[PDB]
Design a protein around this ligand. Structure first.
Ligand SMILES: Nc1ncnc2c1ncn2[C@@H]1O[C@H](COP(=O)(O)OP(=O)(O)O)[C@@H](O)[C@H]1O
Ligand SMILES: [Mg+2]
Ligand SMILES: [Zn+2]
Lengths: 646, 198, 49
């Protein structure tokens, strides 16, 4: 302590009695924690804990020799943010009993950790100024593979779960310190919140008038709060169990930190609270409901790609990692290496994998506001038109499980309202609220539409606006707005009759309106060549799956590309693009082929920019535009189709 | 009731809508669809919340206990202690109102002339006197779309509109111009519409 | 009658009768104390309590 104001911890709930009980050492009532011992143990953990298996890439700006969290405290000194994220795994490795005490008694233990961190920090720094005393965030607790298995025995304990955010309610203010003024002499007093309630003065302390003191709402002190409806991603999925929605609650710093559709590991206290029979009576129900007072949000995932927030953050890569990635870029076959890395167990779909990689990398974001032109879609859209059993669904699922902010819909399982938005009755505030859809939840990510042909036009019409202007203009009875839907669409289509007739042309087989097909800036025909070598090697691969680049480098490469690569058209690439579009239109003028409109010049620009980004060039080049030409041409099998027939 | 502008939406989010309160002169200074700019102070307003979970009670600090037959238990005790829930909403109190992007620095031509400053008025006058103003406006309004000069001219005439009139018997003579664009895909129809809107 | 929750139909106003046999009674007595005659001033009355 150095005079810093110790801010309250609304996440830890209303303070309890805190009854000390001597066992004859001096535990807290109902627990086996003694404040002195817990504080000393955590102080020791901070002073001297080193991670032996830590990696320079895992920890950036952290020496694997010096104690871990002392450097974190140094960072908190350098910046103003007085928060310290402490790994429950590290605590378990250091002092296992300390970990068990933390997990079983979070409300009691965590304040001791706060005291210890404040003591150490203010001893080291007698002059650093912080708005409030540092606060400790314990995360990475042993993952709860399914909330449905948690039991009343686990209530009020620190758990950790994973899931995507479905909704985030508005900022709810919470009282912390009521302000009272006398209606006679104007005497002012303050009453801090105590155990989840406030005691009215009932008598003036200056004029002694009974009940002359009135509460001043807008002169009181409040704290932020926010309901967050999150959908659980249970690793353990027992038979017959439907998906799970769990109510979260953020407090005063986690409010509005995770948007809908974001996937997060949330560590927090598992609370059970009563249900009033009516919102007006105080009678409660014998059966409680449960929610999560969120202590920590973690975005990083091992099996996914870097999120938007992580990419935005400056210190995401060490200088060594940056140099390694730049070397990998200067490598000449980086494009094919990354394409092969994508979906490692999908056999030689080189062109489709390259297209999906370009989709992941994405073009450049352009600010055409000054031009009065509108908003240009930098995202790339792909349509895999193929016979059932051609692995298009497998590729769709791989992308869905790979990309952050990914949504998945199939066939007639969706609807226009369910994809765009709708109005429901939030069954915790009894208020009517607006719930997004898949196309919005995937706003800055990907939507995977399997069975893209069984999508009766009523809902397929919605995709026009999304794929053209990245906007979803909803004008319903009460709510008018335009939601950002800057998604990338990966769709899978089956030729009519579920089989590709080798007599009808490309368009006649696809059976999708040109208005829509011109939106997709890549269309891959997954067609089966009756080839001995292909069949034999495919059988070898499929059997090999029955008995036996790094994701890390791929993820880091994509993150760095998005972070600091903004390819710009060069003059030579511009002329090449002009010639490419004229030639492509000339070719597409054929009868049954996929005709090329200026949307296809836009598509070529997008693909060239994506390839330049893959190369980290920062300047789109004739090589990139030529590769875009080649990819768009091999897709649809233009080379293998005559300008008359298919 | 106002809602957040599209320029500030976070990813995948629905715009936040809040009610702002105008008092006195500004009472009717905001109209639907306007991109206003409210200046004032945020405030809290007590709420009759339907939350079924009890939270943040407020009660008397005087220690009083009901006697036998009048125990401070149940609704009786809650009322006696004066327990009330402290549930609040966030509401904005705007003292002044003004458009986010002022157009100038009843309605009539003289009113517009007076409202607009000397520089803006002289600019309007000089452009009105300028020749080939038709083509100048079309080009300056659609600087990215190529061709479709007829469509540009028609949209400009639509923007300028006609002169509505009413006949003696009451029947009105519509003066507004209606324009439709039909054509092949990727012909800049949506581009024309978005130009017009922006 | 505060115990109206056992049934929706309500008990009257002023419903309570004292049950005599359930009363813990004690002996009580009233005495009339008079000031001491040697304490009463010369021309005065004896005070009482
Ligand atoms: N004649 C043209 N001049 C300039 N750009 C054009 C022209 N025709 C099409 N485009 C481009 O094609 C893109 C798609 O056109 P779009 O607005 O979808 O037309 P439509 O809505 O009629 O299909 C636009 O972003 C626009 O830049
Ligand atoms: Mg259109
Ligand atoms: Zn007073």
């Amino acid at each position: 302590v150095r005079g810093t104001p110790v801010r309250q911890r609304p996440d830890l709930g209303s303070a309890q009695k805190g009854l000390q009980v001597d066992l004859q050492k001096l535990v807290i009532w109902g627990t086996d924690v003694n404040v002195a011992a817990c504080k000393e143990n955590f102080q020791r953990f901070l002073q001297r804990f080193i991670d032996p298996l830590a990696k320079e890439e895992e920890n950036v700006g952290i020496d694997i020799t010096e104690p871990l969290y002392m450097q974190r405290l140094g960072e908190i000194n350098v910046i103003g943010e007085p928060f310290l994220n402490v790994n429950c795994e590290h605590i378990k490795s250091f002092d296992k009993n300390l970990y068990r005490q933390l997990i079983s008694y979070p409300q009691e233990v965590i304040p001791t950790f706060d005291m210890a961190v404040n003591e150490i920090f203010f001893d080291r720094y007698p002059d650093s100024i912080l708005e409030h005393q540092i606060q400790v965030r314990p995360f990475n607790a042993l993952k709860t593979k399914n909330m449905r298995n948690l039991n009343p025995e686990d209530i009020d304990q620190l758990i950790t779960i994973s899931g995507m955010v479905i909704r985030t309610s508005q900022l709810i203010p919470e009282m912390q310190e009521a302000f009272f003024q006398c209606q006679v002499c104007a005497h002012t007093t303050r009453v801090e919140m105590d155990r989840g309630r406030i005691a009215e003065p009932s008598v003036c302390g200056r004029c002694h008038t009974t009940h002359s003191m009135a509460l001043i709402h807008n002169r009181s002190l409040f704290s932020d709060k926010q309901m967050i409806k999150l959908q659980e991603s249970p690793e353990d999925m027992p038979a017959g169990q439907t998906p799970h929605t769990v109510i979260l609650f953020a407090h005063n710093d986690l409010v509005d930190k995770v948007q809908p559709g974001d996937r997060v590991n949330v560590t927090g206290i598992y609370r059970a609270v009563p249900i009033r029979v009516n919102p007006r009576v105080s009678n409660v129900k014998s059966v409680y409901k449960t929610h999560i007072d969120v202590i920590h949000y973690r975005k990083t995932d091992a099996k996914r790609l870097h999120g938007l927030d992580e990419e935005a953050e400056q210190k995401l890569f060490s200088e060594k990692r940056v140099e390694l990635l730049k070397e990998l870029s200067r490598k000449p076959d980086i494009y094919e290496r990354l394409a092969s890395a994508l979906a490692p167990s999908i056999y030689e779909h080189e062109d489709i994998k390259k297209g999906i990689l370009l989709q992941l990398f994405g073009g450049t974001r352009k600010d055409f506001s000054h031009t009065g032109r509108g908003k240009f879609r930098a995202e790339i859209n792909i349509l895999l038109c193929g016979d059932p059993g051609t692995s298009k669904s497998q590729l769709l699922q791989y992308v869905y499980n790979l990309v952050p902010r990914g949504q998945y819909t199939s066939g007639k399982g969706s609807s226009a309202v369910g994809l765009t938005a709708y109005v429901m009755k939030d069954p915790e505030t009894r208020q009517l609220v607006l719930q997004t859809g898949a196309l919005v939840l995937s706003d800055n990510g990907i939507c995977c539409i399997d069975e893209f042909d069984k999508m009766n036009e009523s809902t397929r019409s919605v995709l026009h606006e999304v794929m053209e202007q990245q906007t979803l203009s909803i004008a319903k009875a009460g709510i008018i707005c335009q939601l950002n839907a800057r998604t990338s669409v990966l769709a899978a289509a089956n030729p009519i009759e579920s089989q590709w007739n080798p007599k009808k042309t490309t368009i006649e087989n696809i059976q999708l309106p040109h208005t829509l097909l011109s939106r997709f800036d890549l269309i891959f025909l997954m067609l089966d060549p009756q080839d001995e070598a292909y069949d034999r090697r495919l059988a070898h691969h499929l059997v090999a799956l029955y008995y036996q680049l790094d994701m890390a480098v791929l993820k880091d490469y994509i993150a760095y590309a998005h972070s600091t690569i903004m390819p710009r058209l060069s003059e030579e690439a511009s002329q090449a693009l002009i010639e490419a579009y004229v030639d492509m239109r000339k070719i597409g003028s054929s009868r049954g082929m996929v005709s090329a409109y200026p949307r296809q010049l836009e598509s070529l620009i997008r693909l060239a920019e994506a390839h330049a980004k893959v190369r980290l060039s920062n300047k789109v080049e004739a090589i990139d535009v030529e590769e875009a030409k080649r990819l768009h041409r091999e897709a649809l099998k233009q080379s293998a189709t005559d300008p008359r027939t298919g | 009731r106002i809602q957040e502008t599209q320029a500030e939406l976070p990813r995948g989010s629905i715009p936040r809508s809040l009610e702002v309160i105008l008092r006195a002169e500004a009472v009717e200074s905001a109209q639907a669809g306007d991109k206003c700019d409210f200046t004032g102070t945020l405030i809290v307003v007590p709420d009759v919340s339907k939350l079924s979970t009890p939270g943040a009670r407020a009660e008397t600090n005087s220690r009083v206990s009901g006697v036998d037959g009048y125990e401070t238990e149940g609704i009786r005790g809650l009322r006696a202690l004066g327990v009330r829930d402290l549930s609040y909403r966030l509401v904005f109190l705007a003292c002044c109102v003004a458009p986010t992007n002022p157009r100038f620095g009843e309605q009539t031509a003289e009113s517009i002339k007076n409202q607009m400053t000397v520089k803006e008025w002289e600019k309007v006058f000089e452009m009105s006197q300028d020749k080939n103003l038709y083509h100048n406006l079309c080009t300056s309004l659609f600087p990215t779309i190529h061709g479709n000069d007829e469509v540009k001219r028609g949209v400009l005439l639509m923007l300028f509109g006609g002169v509505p009139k009413t006949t003696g018997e009451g029947t009105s003579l519509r003066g507004d111009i209606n324009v439709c664009i039909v054509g092949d895909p990727s012909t800049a129809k949506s581009q024309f519409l978005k130009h017009v809107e922006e | 009658c505060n115990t109206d929750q056992a049934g929706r139909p309500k008990c009257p106003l002023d419903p309570y009768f004292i049950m005599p046999d359930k009363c813990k009674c004690v002996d009580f007595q009233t005495l009339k104390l008079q000031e001491l005659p040697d304490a009463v001033p010369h021309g005065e009355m004896p005070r009482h309590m």
